[PDB]
C-alpha cells in the first residue's frame, strides 16, 4: 500500500506542476523589463544600538516605528528607543539561547524563546513598572525559532519540532497546531490581515497556513536548501523567502509559483533575514557575510548594499512606516539605516 | 518643552541604570566559560553532567550544570529536548569557550558516527574557531572489550591492522599493550580529523576518561585555560 500511496503522491505532484506551468505564461522579469530601475539605493547607518554582550539573534520593530526589541544569546531582551538610541528596557532571560523575539502590535507585551522550547511572554506595562514574565507557553518539543504576536491574546510560534502553533496566551494552551513541515520551521510571517501566515522550514519548502482553520492552504518548493527567512509582501498576496542556497525567491499566493529569484554569482552564503520596504519595491536580505543586500523586488537587481556589521547579519526588520531598517548582527551590534 | 526635557532626562536615567546593570552582566558573562556537551546520547554526557553536579540539570530544554574549578566558573550545557537534526540549533553555540565531545570509545559500531559528528563540528562555518575537549569515555569498557576480544576494531576500522602505537603514548600502570594501541588508535582517528583542517584557529584536547574518573573537572579547566591562552596569544599578536 505504501508504493501505491507514494505513486499517488507523485501523480498529484506532477498534476500541480502541470497546473502551475499552465498558469505560468509570462515572467515577472519579462513584465517589469519596462519598469525603470530603482537606482543605486544607498542607506546610511544613522543609529548604532550597542549594549548587547553576545550575538544578536532576533529583532522586531514596534508598531510605533520607534521602539525596538532585540534578543541576544547572552540572555537579554533590550527594548531600545531607536529615535534617541536609549535603552528603554533590559529583560534578563532564564535561558540565554533565545533565537526569536517578538513585539506585540499594542506594545504591551514582548515575546522570546529558543532552545528551552518555551515562548516567554513579558508584560512591558506592569503597574509596578518592572517587566514580568506574564506567560510561559510550553508544548513545543523543539527550539522556538520564531514567534509573532497575532494580538495581545494570541501568538503564532514556529519551532524546531517541525510544527507551528497558535497559542492563546491567556490560557497558555496551544489552541491550534500547524503540521506538515518536514524540517525545522525556521521563520514565520503573519499576513497584514493576520488571517493567514507563511512558514519556511528546513525542508526547502514554505507553507501557507490559515490561522482560523489550522490547515495548510498551499506549499511552495522553489528553494534548494533550508529556508532561514521569510517575509510577507506588503500587499499580502506574495512573500519572499531566503535560504541557505544563497538565493531569495518571491512566491505569489494566487499564482502559486515562483515569481522571481534574487541571487548573484558572487554570493555563496545563506540568507539569514529578509524584509520588504513599504511599497514592496525593495527586498532587504541579510547574508552570512557582513552585508545586507537590498534588491529591486520587481527587477531582481541588487539595488544596494548595507555594510558595517563585523559579524554575520542575523536579523533584519523594516520599520512600520518604512523610515528605517534595523539590522542586528552576530557582532552584538544593531544598526538603524536610513 | 519643559515636560519633553523631563521625559528625555528620565529616559537618560533609565538608560544609565540599564547600562550599569549591563556592565555588571558583562563582567559576570566574561568571567564565566560556556561549554557545549556533545556526543551520542547513549553514552557519556549524562554521567559527566552528574559528576560535575556532584563536584544544576533540568529536564525541560537544555540540561545546564554550573560548576567551579579553583575560582573559575564553568557553565556546561547538554542540549536535550531537541530533535535529532543538529545543523540549525548548533549555530547558536558559535561563541562557547569549548565543545566537550564525549565518545563511547568502547562502542566500535557507533565510533564512525561519532567521527562524522566530530568532523561536522570541526568543519562547521560557525564552529571553525571553537576548540573541542575530546572525552573518550568508557575506557574501562574499552579495556574490557579489548581484553575479551569478542569484537575487533579491524572489523569496523580496517586501518587498525596496520596501526602502531605512538611513541609519545603514556600507558597507565597495569595496562596491556593491546588496550593502549586500541585506545590510541581511537584517539588518533579524532586527532586526524582535527589536524586535517583548522589553520591553527582551534585545537582538540583528547582525554581518556571513565565513569569513576573524578579528574574531568580539572581536565576541562586546564583545556579551557589553554584555549583562552591561545586566544590571548592570537589577540596579543604573539600567536
Amino acid at each position: 500500500e505504501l508504493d501505491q500511496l507514494r505513486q499517488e503522491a507523485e501523480q498529484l505532484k506532477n498534476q500541480i506542476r502541470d497546473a502551475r506551468k499552465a498558469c505560468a505564461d509570462a515572467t515577472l522579469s519579462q513584465i517589469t523589463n519596462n519598469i525603470d530601475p530603482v537606482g543605486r539605493i544607498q542607506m546610511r547607518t544613522r543609529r548604532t544600538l550597542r549594549g548587547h554582550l553576545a550575538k544578536i539573534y532576533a529583532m522586531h520593530w514596534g508598531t510605533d516605528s520607534r521602539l525596538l526589541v532585540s534578543a541576544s544569546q547572552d540572555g537579554k531582551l533590550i527594548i531600545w528607543d531607536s529615535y534617541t538610541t536609549n535603552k528603554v528596557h533590559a529583560i534578563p532571560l532564564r535561558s540565554s539561547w533565545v533565537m526569536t523575539c517578538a513585539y506585540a502590535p499594542s506594545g504591551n507585551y514582548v515575546a522570546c524563546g529558543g532552545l528551552d522550547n518555551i515562548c516567554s511572554i513579558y508584560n512591558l506595562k506592569t503597574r509596578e513598572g518592572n517587566v514580568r514574565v506574564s506567560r510561559e507557553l510550553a508544548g513545543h518539543t523543539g527550539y522556538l525559532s520564531c514567534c509573532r504576536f497575532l494580538d495581545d491574546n494570541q501568538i503564532v510560534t514556529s519551532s524546531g519540532d517541525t510544527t507551528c502553533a497558535l497559542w492563546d496566551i491567556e490560557t497558555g494552551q496551544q489552541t491550534t497546531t500547524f503540521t506538515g513541515h518536514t524540517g525545522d520551521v525556521m521563520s514565520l510571517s503573519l499576513a497584514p490581515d493576520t488571517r493567514l501566515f507563511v512558514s519556511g522550514a528546513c525542508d526547502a519548502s514554505a507553507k501557507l497556513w490559515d490561522v482560523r482553520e489550522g490547515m495548510c492552504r498551499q506549499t511552495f518548493t522553489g528553494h534548494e536548501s533550508d529556508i532561514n527567512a521569510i517575509c510577507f509582501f506588503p500587499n499580502g498576496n506574495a512573500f519572499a523567502t531566503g535560504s541557505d542556497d544563497a538565493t531569495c525567491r518571491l512566491f505569489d499566493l494566487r499564482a502559486d509559483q515562483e515569481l522571481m529569484t534574487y541571487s548573484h554569482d558572487n554570493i555563496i552564503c545563506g540568507i539569514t533575514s529578509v524584509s520588504f520596504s513599504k511599497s514592496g519595491r525593495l527586498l532587504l536580505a541579510g547574508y552570512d557575510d557582513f552585508n545586507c543586500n537590498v534588491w529591486d523586488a520587481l527587477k531582481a537587481d541588487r539595488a544596494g548594499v548595507l555594510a558595517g556589521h563585523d559579524n554575520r547579519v542575523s536579523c533584519l526588520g523594516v520599520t512600520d512606516d518604512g523610515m528605517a531598517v534595523a539590522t542586528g548582527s552576530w557582532d552584538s551590534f544593531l544598526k538603524i539605516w536610513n | 518643552t519643559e515636560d519633553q526635557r523631563n521625559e528625555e532626562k528620565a529616559q537618560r536615567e533609565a538608560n544609565k541604570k540599564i547600562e550599569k546593570q549591563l556592565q555588571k552582566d558583562k563582567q559576570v558573562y566574561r568571567a564565566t566559560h560556556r561549554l557545549l556537551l556533545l556526543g551520542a546520547d547513549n553514552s557519556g554526557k549524562s554521567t559527566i553532567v552528574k559528576q560535575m553536579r556532584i563536584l544544576s540539570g533540568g529536564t525541560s530544554g537544555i540540561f545546564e550544570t554550573k560548576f567551579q574549578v579553583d575560582k573559575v566558573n564553568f557553565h556546561m550545557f547538554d542540549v536535550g529536548g531537541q530533535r535529532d537534526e543538529r545543523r540549525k540549533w548548533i549555530q547558536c553555540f558559535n561563541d562557547v569557550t569549548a565543545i566537550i565531545f564525549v565518545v563511547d570509545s568502547s562502542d566500535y559500531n557507533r565510533l564512525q558516527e561519532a567521527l562524522n559528528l566530530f568532523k561536522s563540528i570541526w568543519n562547521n562555518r560557525w564552529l571553525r574557531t571553537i576548540s573541542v575537549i575530546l572525552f573518550l569515555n568508557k575506557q574501562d569498557l574499552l579495556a574490557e572489550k579489548v581484553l575479551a576480544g569478542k569484537s575487533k576494531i579491524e572489523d569496523y576500522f580496517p586501518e587498525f591492522a596496520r596501526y602502531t602505537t605512538p611513541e609519545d603514548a603514556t600507558p597507565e600502570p597495569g595496562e596491556d599493550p593491546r588496550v593502549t594501541r586500541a585506545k590510541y588508535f581511537i584517539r588518533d582517528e579524532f586527532l586526524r580529523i582535527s589536524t586535517a583542517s583548522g589553520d591553527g584557529r582551534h585545537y582538540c584536547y583528547p582525554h581518556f576518561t571513565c565513569a569513576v574518573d573524578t579528574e574531568n573537572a580539572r581536565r576541562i579547566f586546564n583545556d579551557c585555560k589553554d584555549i583562552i591562552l591561545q586566544m590571548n596569544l592570537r589577540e596579543y599578536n604573539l600567536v
Epitope: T182, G183, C202, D203, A204, T221, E224, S225, D226, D244, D245, A246, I268, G270 | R83, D84, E85, R86, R87, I90, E113, N116, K119, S120, I121, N123, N124, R125, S197
Partner: nanobody, 126 residues
Amino acid sequence: QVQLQESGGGLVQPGGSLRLSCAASGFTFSNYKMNWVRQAPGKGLEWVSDISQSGASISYTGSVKGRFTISRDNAKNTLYLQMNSLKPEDTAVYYCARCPAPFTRDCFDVTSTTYAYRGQGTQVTV
C-alpha cells in the same frame, strides 16, 4: 522541489557486485557534497560513504572502505555506489543524502529519523 530517486538493488547473492544509482533534481548537484547512507533492518540509519562537490575527497565507512566505491557524475547529475563485494550484513535500505548547504565541508545529515534532503531509498538484500 528537491528530489533524490534511487535505483538499483534487489536480491544479490553474497560476493556479487551491485551498482546503486541516484538521480538528483531540484538543485545544482555540482555544488553539494553527496552521501550514501544505510538503514539495516532494525538497526537505524548509518552513514556509508560520501563524495565532495568536485568528485574528489571520497570517504567510506570502515565496514565497506575496501569496496563500495562512490562516484559522482555532475554532468549527468547522478550519484553512484558500486558495491563490488557484497556481504549478508550489507542487506539494508540504501539512501542517497544531500548535505544541507552547498559550499560546506560539514555534513550535518540527520541520519536517524527524518532528513529532508534524502531519497526514498532502495532495498538491497544479500
